[PDB]
Amino acid sequence: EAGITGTWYNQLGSTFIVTAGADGALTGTYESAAGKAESRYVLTGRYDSAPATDGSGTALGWTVAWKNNYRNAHSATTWSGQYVGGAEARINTQWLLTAGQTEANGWASTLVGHDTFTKVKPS
Amino acid sequence: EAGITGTWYNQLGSTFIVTAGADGALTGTYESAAGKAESRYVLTGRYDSAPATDGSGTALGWTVAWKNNYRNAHSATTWSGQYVGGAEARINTQWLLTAGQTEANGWASTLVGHDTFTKVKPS
Amino acid sequence: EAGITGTWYNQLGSTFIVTAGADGALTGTYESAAGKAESRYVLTGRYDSAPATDGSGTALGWTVAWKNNYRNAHSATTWSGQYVGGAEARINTQWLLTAGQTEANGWASTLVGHDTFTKVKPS
Amino acid sequence: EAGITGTWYNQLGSTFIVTAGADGALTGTYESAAGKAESRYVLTGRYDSAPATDGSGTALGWTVAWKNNYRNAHSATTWSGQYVGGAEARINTQWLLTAGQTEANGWASTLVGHDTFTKVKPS
Ligand SMILES: O=C(CCCC[C@@H]1SC[C@@H]2NC(=O)N[C@@H]21)NC1CCN(c2ccncc2)CC1
Ligand SMILES: O=C(CCCC[C@@H]1SC[C@@H]2NC(=O)N[C@@H]21)NC1CCN(c2ccncc2)CC1
Ligand SMILES: O=C(CCCC[C@@H]1SC[C@@H]2NC(=O)N[C@@H]21)NC1CCN(c2ccncc2)CC1
Ligand SMILES: O=C(CCCC[C@@H]1SC[C@@H]2NC(=O)N[C@@H]21)NC1CCN(c2ccncc2)CC1
């Protein structure tokens, strides 16, 4: 009933596969079409399992650490956003991507951006 | 060996209790001293379980959805940052806090900020 | 030659009117179609007046304080982004919107988002 | 009366020299102690010249493009924040630093961070 479980695609062509559990959990895999990434990475997150009923979206977030058996990019992305249902359902997000840095370079550790996920792929 | 498992406190006085699993998982609870929050909330996230050895920090992230048995603030925060070890260990983060909004208000859904966690409480 | 001077429209329908001076200055007016805003506000900013020639965009930023003769929303937005030329020229930005807050509420002062500007209006 | 005009120092040791004009303008120079920066750069911005009187801070923002006669880092930073007066006056900010990138790399153009400015230097 949450509308979230399934496969989602962003504007870069990345693939977000997620299960929204009854307890508020998000689990799944992420495959990025961009950056220092190859194949699937574990993700986990949380969502509001009792959202408002006034047309507001459903708040959520998740994390990927960019380490798997094929690569380690010494970094992690978190996406914070909301699911907005309907015939053209979307998950609208903004993200923070932190790379490990020495203390001297810590000020320059974190990229910010935004991803829009839909249930069908962009062309 | 990761240095992450345990209790951490930020500059607001919030309490972050986390277990860093051997597989890269973060699990635990978060108690915020600020905002529309009461008692403990579930968190989950990920960290780089094989960080660089050049003095760089360990990248990580986690999510809290602000729903428990006592409150629902129809929102979720993700923290993205890194752990920096030593005698004054820290987790330096930046966060995104998305609230569910109607489509018309979506542009105004997301707060950004920064939290510094240490192993002893601020005064 | 910079391609920046003129009128630009974002996805909300806001109107950004700017002059890019030879010295790196941006001046102009901003009219927001969203939020606590009415009519035109002063803006000022800066851009890279000698960008790279490898196809990279031109970095820039500007600020609006949301006070004019008709409203005061006790807030300011900064947009940071780049101009990307061509037949479908764009200014791709991300923004930070800070509202004045008491010290206790300072953690919740700042919204983040993203605006895409084009030379013709969205429909 | 605004409290803003003068010299300010952040936690990196950078020096922000600003004049707050009666019309809401900020002008001055910025010297960064970090990154691809040498000597002083022009800045310009805006502030709320009629802030609330309830103890809330004064909203403001400014931009530096990282080009002067000595360097060009093909980038620009905007700081968005507020001035909080008193015996230990501060300007609390968050910033976005966009670097020119090709279209393919645009997703990775923008760093985010936070700077705290005070009227005396850190040690
Ligand atoms: O490229 C990756 C890992 C893959 C990220 C993919 C990103 S996630 C948000 C966006 N949405 C997607 O679907 N895909 C992209 N990691 C880097 C990034 C840049 N890095 C630094 C280093 C130093 N300072 C700052 C940044 C080094 C490590
Ligand atoms: O207050 C909370 C839940 C608790 C958040 C606590 C935050 S997490 C980052 C920081 N670090 C901490 O340790 N504690 C704080 N949620 C709101 C926030 C403001 N909300 C909106 C609504 C509409 N538009 C924008 C924002 C409504 C819901
Ligand atoms: O609405 C405005 C002024 C107009 C902003 C228009 C925005 S600029 C980025 C975006 N692009 C546009 O073209 N238009 C929009 N200001 C508020 C916002 C919310 N405010 C708070 C208060 C307390 N905490 C957090 C936030 C109160 C003051
Ligand atoms: O280093 C500078 C210019 C000086 C910035 C100084 C910064 S301003 C916020 C902070 N507060 C200060 O007082 N000082 C620092 N510019 C870069 C940054 C990293 N760059 C990229 C490239 C590609 N992708 C992402 C990022 C390349 C250009």
Author numbering:
A (entry chain A), B (entry chain A), C (entry chain A), D (entry chain A): 14 to 136
List sentences quoted exactly from the publication behind this structure:
We describe here the use of an artificial cofactor employing the well‐known biotin‐streptavidin system to catalyze a Baylis‐Hillman reaction. As protein host, we chose streptavidin, as it can be easily crystallized and thereby supports the design process. There are several examples using streptavidin as the host for these cofactors, since its natural ligand biotin binds strongly (K d∼10−15 M) and is easy to modify with catalysts at the carboxylic acid group. No enzyme is known to naturally catalyze the Baylis‐Hillman reaction, a very versatile and atom‐economic C−C bond forming reaction for the production of various functionalized compounds and intermediates of active pharmaceutical ingredients (APIs).
We chose a derivative of DMAP as the artificial cofactor due to its low steric demand, which will facilitate its inclusion into the protein scaffold. The protein host around the cofactor was rationally designed on the basis of high‐resolution crystal structures obtained after each variation of the amino acid sequence. The location of the catalyst is in a shallow cavity at the surface of the protein. The system was evolved through repeated cycles of mutagenesis, activity tests, and structure determination. According to the presented structures and calculations the catalytically active site is too shallow to undergo interactions with 1.
